[PDB]
Amino acid sequence: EPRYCICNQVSYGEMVGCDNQDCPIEWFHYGCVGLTEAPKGKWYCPQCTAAMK
Ligand SMILES: [Ca+2]
Numbered sequence: 001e002p003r004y005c006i007c008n009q010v011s012y013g014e015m016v017g018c019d020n021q022d023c024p025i026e027w028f029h030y031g032c033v034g035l036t037e038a039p040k041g042k043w044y045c046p047q048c049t050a051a052m053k
């Protein structure tokens with residue numbers, strides 16, 4: 001029921017959480033952010049990565 005990610009679709013498949021506390025979206029599908037495997041440490045989504053540089 002809740003929609004997640006930049007794509008605004010329900011949770012499906014492998015999901016990753018952005019570790020920036022102010023991330024507006026928080027939860028993303030792996031594919032929508034270019035991942036194939038679980039991050040081995042903290043992970044920041046592309047939008048938060050752009051905001052942190
Ligand atoms: Ca949304």
Ligand SMILES: [Zn+2]
Binds near residue numbers: 007028029032
């Ligand atoms: Zn998505």
Ligand SMILES: [Zn+2]
Binds near residue numbers: 018019020023025047
């Ligand atoms: Zn984020």
